[PDB]
Amino acid sequence: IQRTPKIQVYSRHPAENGKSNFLNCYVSGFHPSDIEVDLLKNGERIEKVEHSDLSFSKDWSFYLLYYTEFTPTEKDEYACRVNHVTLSQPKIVKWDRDM
Amino acid sequence: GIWGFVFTL
Amino acid sequence: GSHSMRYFFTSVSRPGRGEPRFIAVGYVDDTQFVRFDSDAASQRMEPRAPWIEQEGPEYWDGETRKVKAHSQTHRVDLGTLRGYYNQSEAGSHTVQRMYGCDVGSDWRFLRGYHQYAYDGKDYIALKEDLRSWTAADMAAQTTKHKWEAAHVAEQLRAYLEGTCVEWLRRYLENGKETLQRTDAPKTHMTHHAVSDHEATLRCWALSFYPAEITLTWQRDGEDQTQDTELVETRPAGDGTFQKWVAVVVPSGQEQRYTCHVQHEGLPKPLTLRW
């Protein structure tokens, strides 16, 4: 079986320009468990990214939280990039502070 | 605390 | 309210070389409190909540011994299952296992469960009476017969009804400052103009615990699901959770619409209006 991941990108705390926060990439609903997740700052990959321990839901689909520290600004564009066997090209989800 | 006696399939 | 202790185990085989990747995690309700990763340096069951660090070295020695036995059982299972399903050694495959217990508000045994999946599909599961098994296909049916022979259900049931609940009770006491605390959602509403004619109202719930919540939109005091959007509840990363629900409305008609929020941390459901 192969289930494609759902992705949400968002901050841990309400976003305010100039104030320390955390950038999350939550990937869920996928199978098998091998997956590649990067957080992007202006297209380039952020280096110190941590992630939760692999777990799964009632329907056996996996989920992971990837996170790093960031400081929101008006110019900088943040994103999450996910690759997985079910995807032909890497899926990129932009951070939108209103979602 | 996890189960102390798991069985193989 | 009610409480649960659950353990999640995943093993993934690595055909090219070596033992499977094995990851084990334990939860009390929506709080992870232990982990084991076969790829980590320690090779020990590790704490992931402050209140479990209270446990002395005999706890960690016992948990570590047990989780390693789990690891090796899954290693063997992966080989067995590959034979049962006539698959080659060329591919990676997964076994997943989840078990644990629920208790009610009285903290006494309510429900126990134990289930097992191979490559993301149901394989075998304990029935709710804790006395019989549900085998999804003929391969699993062999395991069912084997386990019936060896009276597995009886010993598992002793754990799920007895030992599991005793641990949960103990964890609930030692961790009461967080485990027995409900965090009510912090709510607010945002407004977004799409055009001169259409607007989006978004109702936010933040920082809540446990994860279970309901957000609903009403129009003129009646439920509305059309033109609404509801994201999956997501972890904030600090142990709490987030969710929002949005509705599309005609510009100028915002006041007709109300967001309704139900959560254990709320004596009465909340109502929001723009």
Side-chain angles (χ1 to χ4, degrees), chain A residues 1 3 6 8-14 22 24 26 28-29 31-33 51-63 65 97-99, chain C residues 8-10 12 23 25 27 32 35 48 94 96-98 115-117 119-122 192 202 204 206 231-238 242 244:
Chain A
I1 85 178
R3 282 176 274 187
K6 306 191 70 63
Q8 302 193 56
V9 189
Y10 55 105
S11 51
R12 174 185 303 179
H13 305 285
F22 288 79
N24 292 324
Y26 180 57
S28 60
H31 216 289
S33 57
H51 63 83
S52 58
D53 302 312
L54 185 69
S55 190
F56 56 86
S57 320
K58 181 177 187 205
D59 70 347
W60 307 108
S61 56
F62 291 107
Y63 61 86
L65 178 67
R97 63 184 64 193
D98 304 277
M99 301 185 74
Chain C
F8 301 77
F9 308 88
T10 308
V12 176
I23 300 173
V25 299
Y27 286 83
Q32 181 196 347
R35 85 189 274 264
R48 278 291 171 274
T94 311
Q96 291 163 271
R97 184 202 304 267
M98 184 280 297
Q115 53 197 35
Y116 200 105
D119 287 338
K121 300 169 301 181
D122 279 0
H192 310 267
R202 177 163 294 111
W204 295 81
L206 299 171
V231 289
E232 173 184 11
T233 302
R234 63 207 192 179
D238 56 5
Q242 306 185 349
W244 56 254

Side-chain angles (χ1 to χ4, degrees), chain B, chain C residues 7 63 66 70 77 99 147 159 171:
Chain B
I2 62 178
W3 192 15
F5 305 98
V6 279
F7 292 86
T8 62
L9 267 31
Chain C
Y7 286 100
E63 293 304 294
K66 294 183 293 181
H70 278 59
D77 291 345
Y99 63 72
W147 284 5
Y159 168 81
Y171 296 149

Side-chain angles (χ1 to χ4, degrees), chain A residues 82-84 86-92:
Chain A
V82 177
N83 200 21
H84 185 252
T86 59
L87 305 169
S88 324
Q89 329 79 44
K91 177 61 182 178
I92 300 188

Side-chain angles (χ1 to χ4, degrees), chain C residues 12-51:
Chain C
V12 176
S13 57
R14 293 166 158 169
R17 171 189 78 230
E19 291 181 0
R21 177 80 176 284
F22 172 77
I23 300 173
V25 299
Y27 286 83
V28 171
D29 305 327
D30 295 307
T31 305
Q32 181 196 347
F33 69 106
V34 291
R35 85 189 274 264
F36 180 91
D37 189 335
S38 60
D39 267 15
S42 73
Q43 297 295 303
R44 305 284 293 184
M45 185 78 88
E46 304 172 27
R48 278 291 171 274
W51 50 265

Side-chain angles (χ1 to χ4, degrees), chain C residues 33-208:
Chain C
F33 69 106
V34 291
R35 85 189 274 264
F36 180 91
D37 189 335
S38 60
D39 267 15
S42 73
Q43 297 295 303
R44 305 284 293 184
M45 185 78 88
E46 304 172 27
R48 278 291 171 274
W51 50 265
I52 193 66
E53 295 185 18
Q54 296 183 19
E55 303 293 347
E58 68 285 349
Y59 174 80
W60 299 108
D61 283 331
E63 293 304 294
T64 289
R65 175 183 57 87
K66 294 183 293 181
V67 81
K68 283 187 171 170
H70 278 59
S71 178
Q72 293 298 330
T73 289
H74 285 204
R75 172 190 62 77
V76 178
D77 291 345
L78 279 156
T80 304
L81 292 169
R82 191 184 60 84
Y84 286 172
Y85 291 107
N86 293 320
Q87 296 152 328
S88 57
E89 301 82 0
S92 172
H93 299 277
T94 311
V95 291
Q96 291 163 271
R97 184 202 304 267
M98 184 280 297
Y99 63 72
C101 50
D102 301 340
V103 295
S105 310
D106 53 9
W107 284 19
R108 317 179 139 259
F109 175 83
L110 181 54
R111 179 194 304 102
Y113 32 85
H114 177 288
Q115 53 197 35
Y116 200 105
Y118 182 57
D119 287 338
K121 300 169 301 181
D122 279 0
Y123 184 80
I124 193 158
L126 186 63
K127 280 198 165 63
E128 227 173 52
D129 58 33
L130 272 59
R131 294 177 180 227
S132 57
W133 303 94
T134 298
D137 60 13
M138 297 313 292
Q141 185 70 13
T142 304
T143 308
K144 180 177 178 176
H145 291 311
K146 175 181 183 59
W147 284 5
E148 278 172 351
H151 299 279
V152 175
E154 282 77 3
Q155 305 185 20
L156 181 50
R157 173 193 183 190
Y159 168 81
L160 297 178
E161 280 187 356
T163 308
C164 176
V165 179
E166 291 180 356
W167 281 115
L168 173 49
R169 287 187 58 103
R170 168 181 181 80
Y171 296 149
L172 285 170
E173 173 68 23
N174 299 354
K176 60 189 173 180
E177 296 302 319
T178 50
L179 298 185
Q180 297 194 59
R181 201 182 80 198
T182 54
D183 297 358
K186 302 166 162 39
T187 59
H188 71 280
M189 201 187 299
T190 58
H191 178 278
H192 310 267
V194 195
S195 57
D196 296 338
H197 292 165
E198 169 188 333
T200 301
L201 290 171
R202 177 163 294 111
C203 181
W204 295 81
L206 299 171
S207 302
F208 57 88

